């Protein structure tokens, strides 16, 4: 991450061992379950692209995912370059160059250049921009390693409603969908794919009911 | 959370890895037992809505609960909007907008906007307001995942009184009730649902006795 | 707890995750053995009543005890109110009210009010006053969950003296007694309830002997 | 590592116990898998050559590797000496000497000399230079303890594509290759060495496809 | 422990949870082996008598020892009182009283009084004085729970010399003895109680030999 | 260790619980393997002789070693005294005495005296001098508890070369030898004591080959 030093200057903070071990443990234990993302985001708050790279490099295994991640990073780095053309020429002495997509991703930029941009007034938030891309890739990975689709989730004959909902929202959390699509999957699927005895009750509760109500209503069978 | 920096400015504090791992462990180990709430409250002291969101996002599983939580958040966000109408128009340059319910819940607001409100003089405590709502939802969850009601708690024939009381107060802690309702459940149920041998003794101690006294009095059988 | 900020002002310190997890572990592992009290006292040093409440709320189980604890808190809160009558009227604008027993216990007081009192010049140490009450209740709990009395502790025929003493002082630590009563239990019981072979020796050492001496003297049989 | 003290002066920071234990655990658990490198780099940020030496010295076992490491360090130290000839003579009183390769590697230099160079204006970044060499050696070790070559990686008849890719990129991460060579191994091998059923599909997707697409396309068989 | 605050004043530092848990673990795991003492001393550096009391109170079990500890504390507190008579009278308003033995042991003194003495110019180091007494008691305990005497340590027929020495110095570390007595036990016992084959060799090495030499000399049989 | 306080003065830093527990764990788990030394050195950076003593005192067991350690300390303390004669006389009021060997080892010196010397301008680095001696003893211990000599290390008929080298360098790390002696053991033994099939190959590589090359060359059999 980054802080201002004793005096005026602005210095890099080494990522702690705890922050590191935590990120590695998350991944060993949770693979690419959705909750990994928040965790990465949390553990990376204030990060430079180096740091972010570091963090990603500390994962062993999941290299298929990691390659998808790079391709997503790449995809975005191109789009950045296209929206912000740079001017290759005489870079005015000790004066800051404009970052390219590769400079944001850390491949063509130093830590010192990175800090430089991040603490500029006004700042170029290269860490956050790189972070946004990384999370994009992380979503994709999450979808890809979701073993089931929302359409394959039906309540079991003898499955309490609470657990169907659990499985449904869990599955739903791991989908490619805008918010509007998830909403739609909910409105269409949740009641439809409930089992017969509970489905009848819920049809009767009508479309304005809360989940608390739905669960209450299917409690007794 | 939030602190004032080296100099005048007011900066975000990343939630630590310990605070994170602790919240995740709590939930893996305790599901939605009542004590989870304090723990969440403690681990979240000083939090911005982002942070709170982060914390909630780091839980995998319990997605039925988490959906109830959102609906409760939503319910409250509406009520806020209704009690505080905002004026959509020209937001005066670099000047702070009034938060909506969605801005409090973090969905339509940035961290920078959030800090802004939290450290304003006089402040809009958006973290505490969002926290209050989240705890509301957390109570509801707690009730919903309580597998037994206070009325189903009777002392076993051969159950020491100490343990009946344990089960009764534990059950009672997980109920929807104002303080006045819990009091009432106590005054009506605790002695009534004690087993015969202990019940006689307690009727004889009379209604002003403490629990220490009650336990003392049923010690010997 | 509480500290003075960067500048002049006096701010709340969130109780750490370590302090929290430690208190929870203590109780899971030790129930209400005497040593729990020091531990609570240590983990709570500098605490506001909120914090103390937090800590107590984080224990799941032991709810019979916790109810005794509240009754003891209540008992004390009444006594406080009786010794310090407050004047209900126009609370002079932004000026500090006198705390009631409920304000000390945290039920009718905010954190901000609490800090206010704790850092007043001269201060009202509401945390320490609430702490003293809580420890009182904690003693009572300790006595109540002590499964044996000092009078039931006799040295086994083939029990080395060292271990009898261990059991005796352990039992003695968990009693309701002033210091003078414990002293008395010692002077009357320890030698009397030793087994015959060791008892004879100790009668011969006479009443001024130390425990080191007593143990030395019963070493050889 | 290094920080500026209370006042003007610039002082050494002891490497923490956590940073140490973490590095030792990494190696016990992961031997010389690629991810070890980032970890070492992370745990060593800001390090003086002493510290780096310390860290390396704390590994027991892997002494064949460690000897390769020294030889690589040595190789580099020579190259440094050759590119930067020093002038042996009267070292001007309390004035800084130019570092040799051995002074960078820590063998002929003190901590005080090391700090001196690192915080000079303009600085001689001896820690980073030594770090770069150490990582070079660490790469070599990584290659040497890679038990399989990229050419020996073929998808199993009944191996989902996802896992072949995993094994391929993992193997590829542990190779001696410029970026251009890895690219080349990819373009030549990945599709070629896929199993027949998946290979046909991928030939049909054509050379511009992403891995996400490739995995999508071989999903269904 | 104790530190000077933000501004001029001198404030108490709560003993950390780590320092606490560490002391409790030491004792659960090591009982009263000699090394416990250093550990206690280390964990208690800078402590007030409250803190020290706290630490001692956090041990459950070993109550026979703990009672010996109090008697030793008591013994010393008396001796202090006798060497430093106090003058009971009008304690000059807000002016510091002279500590008694009970004030040093914490029983008749507050934390505020304790800090007061510890940071006085010139200081009364009540923590160190109480610490010295506590360690005295701790030595005694150590001796008392040493199950074997230095005279009972003979090298086994087939016991390598290294291990005899280990057992001998370990036993010797747990004895009541001035330095001069330990020296004497060494000079008299170590060689004498070695087994015949090794004893002959050592007699021949003569009285100026080091242990390194002794071990070298008995290596080969 | 040591730091300058809030204001001008220079104060002792208690060794942390983590630094302590870490040193104890190292030794329980690793006995006197070579890597223990770095670890001790790392964990002790900035230490006063008290602290160092503390650390050594916290090890239980290994008392034969610890006695060798003292003798080595003693040996060195004598040599110091002989090279720096002190003048016993009127020690000029509140003025610093010259340290003896016993004052460096901590036996005749206080912490306050120790800090005094360490922070003097110009300083007497008593911690580093004592540390150097302790490490000397630690080397000796390491040699003594090395169960095998470099001459007894031959490659197994069916032992990959990598593992022979591992065993050889590991053994070599635990020897009494100047750098020049180790070099010599290498040049003479490593190839000579390799097994026949690998030995022939290595003779053919010639004396300038690296270990990387040697391992490469014996890879294939
Ligand atoms: C955890 C989760 N499950 C989902 C299933 C489908 C789609 C999204 C999700 C999410 C992420 C998810 O939406 N998380 C919430 C935070 C949150 C988590 C858990 C309970 C309540 C609030 C979030 O990030 N935001 C901004 C948010 C905050 C309030 C209301 C709605 C959204
Ligand atoms: C822990 C608990 N069990 C209950 C059962 C029924 C209703 C509520 C509860 C509670 C929460 C509960 O009431 N917790 C207490 C704190 C507390 C916890 C444990 C012992 C003593 C004090 C609390 O939050 N407040 C403000 C409080 C403080 C003093 C007296 C009464 C209330
Ligand atoms: C630990 C313990 N066991 C008891 C048995 C009967 C009554 C009380 C106790 C106690 C608490 C107990 O008395 N603890 C001691 C601290 C202590 C603990 C252990 C050894 C020495 C000193 C204490 O709090 N104080 C103020 C104290 C200090 C010195 C002398 C006497 C009392
Ligand atoms: C982790 C990994 N696997 C490889 C296989 C072949 C070659 C190299 C590697 C690497 C290291 C690897 O390339 N790591 C990445 C960081 C990274 C790791 C994981 C996912 C995305 C980005 C890196 O260090 N840099 C500078 C980088 C950043 C963005 C794009 C490309 C490279
Ligand atoms: C650890 C130990 N074992 C003993 C056996 C008999 C008597 C005493 C002991 C001790 C304590 C013991 O003497 N510990 C040493 C520290 C120490 C520990 C281990 C190795 C070297 C130095 C100590 O405290 N001091 C002041 C000391 C320092 C140098 C030389 C001699 C004494
Ligand atoms: C770890 C080790 N194994 C040995 C075997 C024989 C003799 C010595 C050793 C050592 C200690 C050893 O030499 N450690 C190295 C640090 C080190 C450790 C591991 C790999 C590379 C560099 C060291 O302390 N120094 C000053 C050093 C630094 C660079 C080159 C040569 C020496």
Author numbering:
A (entry chain A), B (entry chain A), C (entry chain A), D (entry chain A), E (entry chain A), F (entry chain A): 1 to 221
Task: Recite the paper's sentences.
The core of HIV-1 viruses bearing the capsid change N74D (HIV-1-N74D) do not bind the human protein CPSF6. Here we have shown that the infectivity defect observed for HIV-1-N74D viruses in CD4+ T cells is due to its inability to interact with Cyp A, which exposes the viral core to TRIM5αhu binding and restriction. Although capsids bearing the N74D change do not interact with CPSF6, the infectivity defect that HIV-1-N74D viruses exhibit is due to a decrease in Cyp A binding with a concomitant gain of TRIM5αhu binding, which restricts infection. To explore whether N74D affects the conformation of the capsid hexamer, we have solved crystal structures of full-length N74D hexameric capsid proteins in apo form and in complex with PF74.
To investigate whether the difference between wild-type and N74D capsid conformations occurs during core breathing, we used the small molecule PF74. To this end, we compared the structures of full-length wild-type and N74D hexameric capsid proteins when in complex with PF74. Surprisingly, the wild-type (N74) and mutant (D74) side chains have very different conformations when the capsid protein is in complex with PF74. These results suggest that capsid proteins bearing the change N74D are sampling different conformations when compared to wild-type. To further understand the inability of N74D to bind Cyp A, we compared the structures of wild-type and N74D full-length hexameric capsid proteins in complex with PF74. Our results suggested that both capsid proteins, when in complex with PF74 are sampling different conformations in the assembled core, which may be related to the inability of N74D to bind Cyp A. It is possible that although the Cyp A binding loop is distant from N74D, the change of capsid conformation could trigger an overall shift in the conformation of the core, changing its ability to bind Cyp A. Structural analysis revealed that N74D hexameric capsid protein in complex with PF74 is different from wild-type hexameric capsid protein in complex with PF74, which explains the defect of N74D capsids to interact with Cyp A. In conclusion, we showed that the decreased infectivity of HIV-1-N74D in CD4+ T cells is due to a loss of Cyp A protection from TRIM5αhu restriction activity. Decreased binding of Cyp A to N74D capsid was additionally confirmed in experiments using recombinant Cyp A protein; in this experiment addition of PF74 decreased Cyp A binding to both WT and N74D mutant capsid stabilized tubes. Overall, the change of N74D structure when compared to wild-type could potentially explain the loss of Cyp A binding.
